[PDB]
Amino acid sequence: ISIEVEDIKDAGDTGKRLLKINTPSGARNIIIENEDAKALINGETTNTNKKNLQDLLFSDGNVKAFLQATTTDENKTALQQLLVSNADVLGLLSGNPTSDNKINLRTMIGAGVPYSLPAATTTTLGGVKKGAAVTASTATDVATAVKDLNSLITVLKNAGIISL
Of residues 133-152, those binding a copy of itself (CB under 8 A): 133-134, 136-143, 145-146, 148-150, 152
Would you say 131 and 164 are in contact if contact means Cβ atoms under 8 Å apart?
A: no
> How far is residue 114's CA from residue 139's CA, in Å, rounded to a whole number?
48
Return the number of other C-beta atoms located less than 10 Å from residue 157's C-beta.
13
Return the number of other C-beta atoms located less than 10 Å from residue 91's C-beta.
19
CB of 51 to a copy of itself, least distance (A): 9
CB of 72 to a copy of itself, least distance (A): 9
Return the number of other C-beta atoms located less than 10 Å from residue 36's C-beta.
19
CB of 63 to a copy of itself, least distance (A): 6
Does residue 98 touch a copy of itself according to CB under 8 A?
no
> How far is residue 164's CA from residue 159's CA, in Å, rounded to a whole number?
11
Fill in the DSSP letter of residue 104. H
Does residue 106 touch a copy of itself according to CB under 8 A?
yes
CB of 151 to a copy of itself, least distance (A): 10
> How far is residue 119's CA from residue 116's CA, in Å, rounded to a whole number?
10
CB of 57 to a copy of itself, least distance (A): 6
Would you say 95 and 108 are in contact if contact means Cβ atoms under 8 Å apart?
A: no
Size of the site for a copy of itself (CB under 8 A): 125
Does residue 100 touch a copy of itself according to CB under 8 A?
no
Does residue 5 touch a copy of itself according to CB under 8 A?
yes
> How far is residue 118's CA from residue 13's CA, in Å, rounded to a whole number?
92
Residues 16-35 that bind a copy of itself (CB under 8 A): 16, 18-28, 30-34
Residues 53-92 that bind a copy of itself (CB under 8 A): 53-54, 56-60, 62-63, 66-69, 71, 73, 76, 79-80, 82-86, 88-89, 92
